[PDB]
Amino acid sequence: KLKIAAAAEALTHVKDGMRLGIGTGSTAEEFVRLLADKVSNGFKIIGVPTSERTAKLCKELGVPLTTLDETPHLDLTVDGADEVDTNLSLIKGGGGALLREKIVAAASDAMIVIADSSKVVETLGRFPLPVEVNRFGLGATMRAIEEAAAKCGLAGPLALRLKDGSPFVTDGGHYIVDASFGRIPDPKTLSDALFAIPGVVEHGLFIGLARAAVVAGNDGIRTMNR
Template sequence: MTSLIEQAKQKAAYQAVDEHVLPTHRVIGVGSGSTVVHVVARLLQRDPELNAKTVFIPTSFQSRGLLLDGGLTVGDVEQYPDIDVTIDGADEVDAQLNAIKGGGAAHLQEKVVAEAAKKFVIVADYRKDSKVLGEQWLKGVPVEVVPFAWRAVLKKLQAQGSNDAKLRMAVAKAGPVVTDNGNFIIDAPFGLIKDPVKCLRDIKLITGVVEVGLFCNMAEVAYFGCEDGSVTIRTK
């Protein structure tokens, strides 16, 4: 039995692929996380001849694996800096389509692949749908940092008001989470983030920060799978 949450993720992902991945598209960005599993599943249901003419740009070790396991052709942004559309999950999305991402520590590559796309589409379940960031995602803003700078960055984040900022620790490994890019992650809660652009700028200006998991003014549309089986679409 698929859970309500899994069904919601699947509905949102399938509808977003159906409405935004067009037969004319040749380069598709694919985000990371558990909702994106359904995005790839839907891509694999397309006409195999169409998929054979398309290159898919992953955003993490995880999404690269999903694409390769499906027999799809993968590329990178160095080869394909012009992407037709990128579809990705999110940890939380506000009323203006700003998003927190990086719960899986993949937001650096995700942001590059989203910004390289003509259109950025978010897919999520109902738990991620908020008016203001910080309402439901309480773990904080994921901040990727250069390892040697982590303690200095942590102190700056605390000085910016994130008293509970913490280095993200690994689960099945002693020590910190190490990202696909060889960096560390600090999770920095800021309570309700009423001005995500300012929060993003302030954090990004700390030397040693590689990327911030705040995606502001990037998404054109978000698909939320709801508990009742419907899909809510929010556009800019």
């Protein structure tokens, strides 16, 4: 649809010979398809996958693959997001790949986001914030998340994420708690508060990582910048 043109605009930021971090979800898959077309004309690139599902896609379509162990620093990560605010702070992890996405993006010189107009918000937080937790001590970690929220002036339900009947286990062996805070006006402070909890592994706030964002508007395609 327009989803395609948004990915295609992001692929213009990709240079010959780049070391690339590749996102997960509906939008990054399309970026994979279009970049596969380009290699298939002698465009050279090497990619780190942020999930098994992206990894499979790259191999079926001929996008060369590497690892952060073999390729510890990347030029660019391209990935989707659940919410983008005007500081280009994001909420990510609706797809359950939040940690590998943070690690890959944090290992990169720059991160480009691809989203539609509906994901761009005045204030982050209507999308529930995914928080990745250890299964040991979940009860005390839930308490601490509510107290961490209270101290930052927020509140809302914390819902242990399920798949089928059971808790969702991430690629890395953790549970996810989706925190519905409604409005997160100071992401950095909340991120600090959540990190001070030992049970917290990581969370879906991507702060200061996206240098630019391609948005599929109702009018057409637009890029936001830093």
